[PDB]
Amino acid sequence: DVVVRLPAFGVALADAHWVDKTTLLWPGGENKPIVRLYYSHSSKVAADSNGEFSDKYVKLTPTTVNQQVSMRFPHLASYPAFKLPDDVNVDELLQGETVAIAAESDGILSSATQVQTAGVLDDTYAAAAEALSYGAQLTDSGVTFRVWAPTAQQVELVIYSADKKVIASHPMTRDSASGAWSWQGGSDLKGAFYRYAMTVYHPQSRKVEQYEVTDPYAHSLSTNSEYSQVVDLNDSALKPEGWDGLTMPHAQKTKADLAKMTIHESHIRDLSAWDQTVPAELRGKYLALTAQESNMVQHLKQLSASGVTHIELLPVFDLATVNEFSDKVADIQQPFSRLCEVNSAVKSSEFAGYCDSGSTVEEVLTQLKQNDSKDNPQVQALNTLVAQTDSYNWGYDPFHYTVPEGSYATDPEGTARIKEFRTMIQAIKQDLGMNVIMDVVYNHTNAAGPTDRTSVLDKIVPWYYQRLNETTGSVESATCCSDSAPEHRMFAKLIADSLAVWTTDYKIDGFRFDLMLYHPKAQILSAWERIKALNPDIYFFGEGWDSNQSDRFEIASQINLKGTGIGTFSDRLRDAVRGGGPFDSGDALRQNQGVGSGAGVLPNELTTLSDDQARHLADLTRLGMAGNLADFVLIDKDGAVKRGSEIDYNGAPGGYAADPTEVVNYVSKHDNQTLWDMISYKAAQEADLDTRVRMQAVSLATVMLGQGIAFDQQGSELLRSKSFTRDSYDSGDWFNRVDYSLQDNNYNVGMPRSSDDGSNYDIIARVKDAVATPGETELKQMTAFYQELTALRKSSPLFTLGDGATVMKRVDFRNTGADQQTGLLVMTIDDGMQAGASLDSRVDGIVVAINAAPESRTLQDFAGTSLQLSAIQQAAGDRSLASGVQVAADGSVTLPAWSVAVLELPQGESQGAGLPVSSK
Numbered sequence: 001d002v003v004v005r006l007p008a009f010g011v012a013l014a015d016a017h018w019v020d021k022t023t024l025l026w027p028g029g030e031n032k033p034i035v036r037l038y039y040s041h042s043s044k045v046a047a048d049s050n051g052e053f054s055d056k057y058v059k060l061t062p063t064t065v066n067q068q069v070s071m072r073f074p075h076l077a078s079y080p081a082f083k084l085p086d087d088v089n090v091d092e093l094l095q096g097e098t099v100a101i102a103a104e105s106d107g108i109l110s111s112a113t114q115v116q117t118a119g120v121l122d123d124t125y126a127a128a129a130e131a132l133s134y135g136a137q138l139t140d141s142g143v144t145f146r147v148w149a150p151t152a153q154q155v156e157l158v159i160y161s162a163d164k165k166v167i168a169s170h171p172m173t174r175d176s177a178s179g180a181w182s183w184q185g186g187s188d189l190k191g192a193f194y195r196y197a198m199t200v201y202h203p204q205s206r207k208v209e210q211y212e213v214t215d216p217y218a219h220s221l222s223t224n225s226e227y228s229q230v231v232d233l234n235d236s237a238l239k240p241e242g243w244d245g246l247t248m249p250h251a252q253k254t255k256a257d258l259a260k261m262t263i264h265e266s267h268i269r270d271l272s273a274w275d276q277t278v279p280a281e282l283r284g285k286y287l288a289l290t291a292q293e294s295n296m297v298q299h300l301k302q303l304s305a306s307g308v309t310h311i312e313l314l315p316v317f318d319l320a321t322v323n324e325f326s327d328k329v330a331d332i333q334q335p336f337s338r339l340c341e342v343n344s345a346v347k348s349s350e351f352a353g354y355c356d357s358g359s360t361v362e363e364v365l366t367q368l369k370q371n372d373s374k375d376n377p378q379v380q381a382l383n384t385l386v387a388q389t390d391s392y393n394w395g396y397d398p399f400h401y402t403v404p405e406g407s408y409a410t411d412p413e414g415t416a417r418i419k420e421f422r423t424m425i426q427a428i429k430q431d432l433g434m435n436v437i438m439d440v441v442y443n444h445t446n447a448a449g450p451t452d453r454t455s456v457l458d459k460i461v462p463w464y465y466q467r468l469n470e471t472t473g474s475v476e477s478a479t480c481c482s483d484s485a486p487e488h489r490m491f492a493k494l495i496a497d498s499l500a501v502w503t504t505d506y507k508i509d510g511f512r513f514d515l516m517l518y519h520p521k522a523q524i525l526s527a528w529e530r531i532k533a534l535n536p537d538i539y540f541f542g543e544g545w546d547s548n549q550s551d552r553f554e555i556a557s558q559i560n561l562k563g564t565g566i567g568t569f570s571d572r573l574r575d576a577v578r579g580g581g582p583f584d585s586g587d588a589l590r591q592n593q594g595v596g597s598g599a600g601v602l603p604n605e606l607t608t609l610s611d612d613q614a615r616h617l618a619d620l621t622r623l624g625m626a627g628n629l630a631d632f633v634l635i636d637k638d639g640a641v642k643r644g645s646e647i648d649y650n651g652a653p654g655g656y657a658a659d660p661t662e663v664v665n666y667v668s669k670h671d672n673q674t675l676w677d678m679i680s681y682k683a684a685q686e687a688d689l690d691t692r693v694r695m696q697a698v699s700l701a702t703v704m705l706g707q708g709i710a711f712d713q714q715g716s717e718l719l720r721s722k723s724f725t726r727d728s729y730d731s732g733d734w735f736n737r738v739d740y741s742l743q744d745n746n747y748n749v750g751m752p753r754s755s756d757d758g759s760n761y762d763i764i765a766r767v768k769d770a771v772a773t774p775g776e777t778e779l780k781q782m783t784a785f786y787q788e789l790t791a792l793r794k795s796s797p798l799f800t801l802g803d804g805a806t807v808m809k810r811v812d813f814r815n816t817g818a819d820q821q822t823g824l825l826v827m828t829i830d831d832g833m834q835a836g837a838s839l840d841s842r843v844d845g846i847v848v849a850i851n852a853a854p855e856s857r858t859l860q861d862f863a864g865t866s867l868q869l870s871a872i873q874q875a876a877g878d879r880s881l882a883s884g885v886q887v888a889a890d891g892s893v894t895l896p897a898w899s900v901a902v903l904e905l906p907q908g909e910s911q912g913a914g915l916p917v918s919s920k
């Protein structure tokens with residue numbers, strides 16, 4: 001056997017992949033005579049002083065990739081394949097560093113690279129490891145700790161006292177079949193803090209690292225997640241009174257049940273950070289939801305009574321971007337002096353002069369408003385510094401997937417947060433009458449590598465839980481941060497086990513997957529199958545659409561999830577009604593008007609939108625109101641008969657769903673500009689304040705009165721503004737403010753962050769002061785419009801049919817084709833004899849008319865049909881979106897500008913003719 005030696009001829013990159021027991025995929029070994037897999041247990045492979053590689057190695061022989069490997073890693077199927085002998089001691093090699101080396105016949109090195117072992121790890125240990133349970137599993141009879149670390153050389157369980165002093169370090173017992181380590185002790189360990197002391201090779205640093213890491217299956221933590229804690233979530237001491245009997249206020253069993261879902265996407269701080277009627281110690285906490293006397297809680301109670309059915313919570317799992325040690329945090333309601341003591345950047349800034357002042361941070365920000373402008377964005381200048389050390393962040397930064405966030409609890413030390421979180425869930429369901437959905441972020445981790453404080457998974461099993469670049473081994477960042485690998489068996493299991501805890505132990509009713517398309521379709525479905533065993537009515541849905549992982553596996557996208565029952569946010573109606581797209585900047589923000597802001601019918605001074613383009617948006621909007629079904633048949637802008645899949649959406653088929661319950665419509669969400677800020681960017685100069693409020697309502701009407709599940713951002717009913725901020729994840733209490741005292745909508749409170757919106761300062765300055773800023777009058781008006789819409793949505797089962805086939809049999813549209821009155825959306829829902837059975841004993845049909853235009857419009861296609869205005873809208877009088885609507889003798893219906901009318905055909909002795917869907 002020749003000896004590999006030197007003639008930059010050392011280990012470089014990591015483009016070799018050990019995908020299974022005997023297969024090694026590596027481009028560098030092609031056509032090369034000598035292909036080997038060198039390995040070193042405790043050392044870094046490298047040529048010795050003599051220039052030779054004298055470390056142990058295994059001989060690799062050319063081969064052809066097998067079907068099994070090709071299916072698992074399609075993106076690597078083209079790589080030159082090499083086989084290892086069947087007697088290779090895989091386990092021992094995986095305990096240290098392995099490097100693939102290739103050299104010419106003469107033995108002169110041609111290339112050497114590191115090896116990515118995720119594949120062989122799954123092939124060798126996954127099945128055995130999947131059959132076990134992980135974490136500190138405490139029962140009243142004892143505890144069993146288990147952690148998966150197939151490559152670690154040593155793992156010790158370190159037990160800490162409450163004061164964080166080591167009271168014991170136990171070497172764990174490794175299971176050869178699974179590669180998991182365990183340790184069994186007595187129940188006296190209940191409540192104890194612990195960490196796993198790892199001795200493991202990390203490919204990134206190429207060294208056998210030695211560090212203590214928290215449990216990835218942690219179910220309790222110390223302040224700021226420094227230590228994991230042994231806990232039995234079943235303990236009655238961790239449950240509010242009557243917890244076990246908590247039931248879901250809204251059904252989610254049938255598709256009809258699901259269709260009634262009306263979501264209010266909220267954030268723990270956005271809800272109570274500014275509410276002075278919420279006890280001070282509960283502001284920005286889970287428990288604020290229990291302050292029945294507060295403006296915020298009373299507001300949500302009324303929304304629920306009016307038709308909002310679900311509260312969706314932005315990250316409430318353990319996020320990493322907020323320091324849980326209160327002494328290290330300063331918020332705007334506190335003295336500027338406090339800010340200076342915890343934030344050295346502020347103390348060294350142009351604002352240092354405020355340090356020894358007697359002002360609070362918010363008082364300073366308030367005074368900076370008058371002289372704030374595009375040329376002097378001082379409000380955001382100060383806020384950007386405040387953001388570094390405040391209590392604010394959306395939290396899409398996973399630290400621990402199965403422990404509640406600590407900063408939202410009154411006491412982040414230990415188990416305390418568990419009961420408070422549950423108390424909140426109970427309050428929402430029991431006292432506010434709404435189901436709860438949790439935003440989950442399994443698509444990435446906050447960090448990876450062997451050094452970052454928040455790198456947990458990548459420290460315990462390096463290069464396994466993260467998705468890596470095929471050539472460099474670098475952790476990918478397409479998600480934003482440290483991309484995870486849901487396609488790997490043990491991470492898929494971690495996800496499913498995690499969801500099981502939130503479902504069973506925290507009684508969560510549904511989960512919204514962040515960037516769900518970075519997950520394999522099969523993995524999402526498998527997780528749903530597992531969770532349905534715990535809660536048969538659990539609902540799964542998600543978003544993303546920037547995919548790019550299709551080369552590795554079939555992704556969980558809108559298209560691929562058709563007919564599966566897994567929901568996806570639809571960006572079709574969203575874009576059509578809001579106008580433009582999320583990538584717009586500068587003038588495009590104003591030019592790209594939407595149906596909700598007058599596309600075509602009320603053009604601003606910059607837009608070039610044609611009537612045809614405006615009508616195309618109307619096609620996308622109507623399709624969306626019908627559940628954005630692939631097979632829904634409608635008449636398009638040109639009078640052509642088209643299926644939803646035939647309506648174009650920027651190059652892709654518009655309609656993609658099988659059932660409306662697989663589609664979540666919306667016109668505002670936590671990310672991107674608020675609906676009001678978009679209307680402010682797009683509205684024509686002549687559109688006055690009152691008109692803009694109606695535009696907000698008309699925009700929301702397309703969602704609320706549609707067949708798809710309805711979703712909306714907390715505060716849309718209050719014309720919520722972020723002062724034009726596009727991405728407010730770290731913009732603090734200032735820009736994310738929601739005022740439940742109803743004084744204003746937080747519009748015009750300073751130019752938004754320059755780093756992300758600086759390119760929009762020009763357009764902002766030009767449109768910002770077009771009209772007055774909303775006040776109590778406008779907020780109360782909008783809340784009334786909003787509650788009317790949600791009340792209408794639940795006023796009849798016809799609005800939420802659930803089944804795609806039923807929608808196709810009952811839903812149709814009028815005012816379509818080339819001779820249509822632009823901006824007028826007229827949707828009919830049949831309940832007559834031709835539709836089948838009467839689902840609503842009070843009506844034979846319903847007509848939804850949304851006049852998104854500055855003209856009054858008259859409908860003549862319902863003449864002699866005895867159409868009547870909804871009792872709900874009649875009851876609202878001149879405060880209704882239907883104020884001014886006229887139902888004449890001849891049967892014609894006239895709608896005022898920017899109005900919404902829900903009309904019905906009263907049912908007589910028997911089911912009537914209704915509004916049959918026309919043959920197309």
Ligand SMILES: OC[C@H]1O[C@H](O)[C@H](O)[C@@H](O)[C@@H]1O
Nearest residue numbers: 395396397480481671727729
């Ligand atoms: O915290 C991770 C990410 O969260 C949200 O997606 C923010 O929009 C983004 O800016 C940030 O990088």
Ligand SMILES: [Ca+2]
Nearest residue numbers: 318319320406
């Ligand atoms: Ca945290």
Ligand SMILES: [Ca+2]
Nearest residue numbers: 387388392393
């Ligand atoms: Ca912050």
Ligand SMILES: [Ca+2]
Nearest residue numbers: 548549551552
């Ligand atoms: Ca890729």
Ligand SMILES: [Ca+2]
Nearest residue numbers: 831838840843
């Ligand atoms: Ca009926």
